[PDB]
Amino acid sequence: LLPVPYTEAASLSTGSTVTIKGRPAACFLNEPYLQVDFHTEMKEESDIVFHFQVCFGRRVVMNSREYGAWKQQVESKNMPFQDGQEFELSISVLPDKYQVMVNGQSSYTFDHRIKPEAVKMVQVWRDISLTKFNVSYL
Amino acid sequence: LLPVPYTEAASLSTGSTVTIKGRPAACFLNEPYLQVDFHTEMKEESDIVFHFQVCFGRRVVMNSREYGAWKQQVESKNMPFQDGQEFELSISVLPDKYQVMVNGQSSYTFDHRIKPEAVKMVQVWRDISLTKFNVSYL
Numbered sequence: 001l002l003p004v005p006y007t008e009a010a011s012l013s014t015g016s017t018v019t020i021k022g023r024p025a026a027c028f029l030n031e032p033y034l035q036v037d038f039h040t041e042m043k044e045e046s047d048i049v050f051h052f053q054v055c056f057g058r059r060v061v062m063n064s065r066e067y068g069a070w071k072q073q074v075e076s077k078n079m080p081f082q083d084g085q086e087f088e089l090s091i092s093v094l095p096d097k098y099q100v101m102v103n104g105q106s107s108y109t110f111d112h113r114i115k116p117e118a119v120k121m122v123q124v125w126r127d128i129s130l131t132k133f134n135v136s137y138l
Numbered sequence: 139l140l141p142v143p144y145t146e147a148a149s150l151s152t153g154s155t156v157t158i159k160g161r162p163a164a165c166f167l168n169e170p171y172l173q174v175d176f177h178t179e180m181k182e183e184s185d186i187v188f189h190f191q192v193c194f195g196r197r198v199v200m201n202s203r204e205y206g207a208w209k210q211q212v213e214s215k216n217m218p219f220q221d222g223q224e225f226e227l228s229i230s231v232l233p234d235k236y237q238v239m240v241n242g243q244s245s246y247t248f249d250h251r252i253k254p255e256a257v258k259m260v261q262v263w264r265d266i267s268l269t270k271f272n273v274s275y276l
Contacts, residue, residue, distance in 0.1 A: 005163055005265075025143055026263065029183050029206075033171070033264075045167050068167075125164065126171075127143075127264060 002133060005125035009042065010135045012116040016093040020124055021086065021132035028057035028083040032127030036091070039121040040114075046121070049114045050098055052091070056081055056127075062110045071113065078107050086131075140271060143263035147180065148273045150254040154231040158262055159224065159270035166195035166221040170265030174229070177259040178252075184259070187252045188236055190229070194219055194265075200248045209251065216245050224269075 010018070018036075026032040038050040048065035055061075056079075063073040080102045081087050090101045093116050100108035124130060148156070156174075164170040176188040186203035193199075194217075201211040218240045219225050228239045231254050238246035262268060 027183050030175075037168075045165050125265065 002130040004128060004130050005123055006130050006133060007044075007121065007123050008133060008135070010038075010119060010122045012038065012093050012119045012135070013137075014093055014095050014116075015138045016116070017134075017136045017138070018091040018122060019132070019134045019136065020089040020091075020130070022089075022124075022128040022130040023086045024056050024081070024084070025127040025129055031058060032056050034128050035124070035126045036089070037123045037125075038116070038119045039123060040118050042121050044123065047114075049112075049116065049119050050091075050110060052100065052108070052110075053126075054081065057083065060108060062108065064113045066114065074110060076108055080105055080107050140268040142266060142268050143261055144268050144271060145182075145259065145261050146271060146273070148176075148257060148260045150176065150231050150257045150273070151275075152231055152233050152254075153276045154254070155272075155274045155276070156229040156260060157270070157272045157274065158227040158229075158268070160227075160262075160266040160268040161224045162194050162219070162222070163265040163267055169196060170194050172266050173262070173264045174227070175261045175263075176254070176257045177261060178256050180259050182261065185252075187250075187254065187257050188229075188248060190238065190246070190248075191264075192219065195221065198246060200246065202251045204252065212248060214246055218243055218245050 024032045034054040036052040037048045040047040051063045060076045064071045092099045097109045097111045162170045172192040174190040175186045178185040189201045198214045202209045230237045235249045
């Protein structure tokens with residue numbers, strides 16, 4: 001249903017939740033990727049407050065791009081995504097960090113390096129099909 | 139125009155040329171990938187006679203997947219692809235190797251590890267839009 005790369009303007013603060021439903025575009029043997037980037041401007045070259053990159057079946061890396069430069073990457077081996085299955089990815093803004101849940105289970109967190117109020121745009125891209133994208137505020 | 143991941147059944151021998159026209163789906167700053175895989179069966183989990191993977195603006199890796207296992211990867215830093223531009227990629231089957239041309243210029247080669255006559259399917263995927271795919275025989 002949704003075009004990939006997927007772009008949507010967005011604002012985030014404490015209590016915001018970004019929810020993504022989709023499925024990998026390839027079998028895990030072929031190592032598809034998923035990337036979710038919280039950008040500071042509508043341009044894709046803009047800074048990235050929160051970068052979330054899944055190499056399905058292998059690892060996750062999280063980072064930020066600040067004044068054009070990648071910072072300290074955080075690596076995680078948690079891999080709750082299942083081969084060939086739909087996933088529901090939810091990214092919640094807490095006061096001190098993002099909490100990333102996959103199919104209802106807390107799987108990753110990432111401390112705010114830039115205030116989330118700096119976010120203007122979310123991009124979801126790489127090797128997924130995308131059926132649902134929502135930003136909600138509570 | 140063409141769906142990505144793109145799958146097309148194919149046969150290859152000496153004199154075969156696979157021609158791909160497309161453009162990256164992201165700015166090079168965001169490091170999109172391109173992957174071209176020559177498979178031994180119609181299944182995406184099948185062995186890969188020739189694997190060609192571009193990290194736009196960084197490197198290329200080439201390899202083969204034989205009985206399910208990746209082999210010796212070949213790395214190249216040649217990067218003739220231009221940021222934000224259409225490319226024309228042509229992969230020609232010579233008796234002893236594949237020759238990969240990008241916009242008319244020979245840019246990569248890869249010696250046959252498996253006879254090209256074992257190929258049954260070509261997949262073009264990752265972060266590109268695809269406007270043209272052809273297999274031709276001379």
